[PDB]
Amino acid sequence: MGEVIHLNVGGKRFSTSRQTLTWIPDSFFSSLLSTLKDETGAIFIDRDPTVFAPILNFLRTKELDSSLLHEAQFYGLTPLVRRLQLREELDRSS
């Protein structure tokens, strides 16, 4: 049961599950999977992959581990955006 989704994000390859990409509703991925594919049949995402790895690992693990915030906003990853903004609030000295 389930579906394996292969992604090509600006030339860097990732493989994940449909579940991982769709637990956040109304996101970029929600729409994407409701498209452009490369030679290999992977879904192509025309974005810099530099911070995609930490985005993907958040979607997998539901825990964290700025450009990350900006990409999370682009992809419409609501809880990640929130937790990143609150991380900033936590650090405030004024």
Author numbering: 17 to 50, 55 to 85, 92 to 120
Task: Pull verbatim passages from the article behind this deposition.
Mutations in another KCTD family member SHKBP1 [(SH3-Domain Kinase Binding Protein 1)-Binding Protein 1] have been identified in cervical cancer and acute myeloid leukaemia. This WD40 repeat-containing protein stabilizes EGFR by disrupting the c-Cbl-CIN85 complex. Last but not least, a further unexpected structure is observed for the BTB domain of SHKBP1, which adopts a monomeric state in the absence of its binding partner Cul3. In contrast, SHKBP1 was observed to migrate as a mixture of monomers and dimers, indicating only a weak propensity for multimerization. Overall, the BTB domains displayed a range of affinities from low-to-high nanomolar: KCTD17 (Kd = 7 nM) > KCTD5 (Kd = 55 nM) > SHKBP1 (Kd = 87 nM) > KCTD13 (Kd = 100 nM), KCTD10 (Kd = 460 nM). We observed that the monomeric SHKBP1 BTB domain was also stably incorporated into a 5 : 5 heterodecamer when mixed with Cul3 protein. Moreover, the SAXS data from this complex displayed an identical scattering curve to the KCTD17-Cul3 complex. Homology modelling based on the conservation between KCTD17 and the KLHL11-Cul3 structure suggests that the close proximity of a neighbouring BTB domain in the KCTD17 pentamer can provide an additional Cul3-binding interface that may substitute for the lack of a 3-box. This model is supported by cryo-EM studies and likely explains how Cul3 is able to ‘glue together’ SHKBP1 monomers into a 5 : 5 heterodecamer by forming contacts across the BTB interfaces. Unusually, the small CTD common to most KCTD family members is replaced in SHKBP1 by a large WD40 repeat domain, a substrate-binding domain also present in many F-box family E3 ligases, such as β-TrCP1. The BTB domain of SHKBP1 is the next closest paralogue in our study and is located in the phylogenetic tree between KCTD5 and KCTD9, the latter of which has also been crystallized as a closed pentamer.
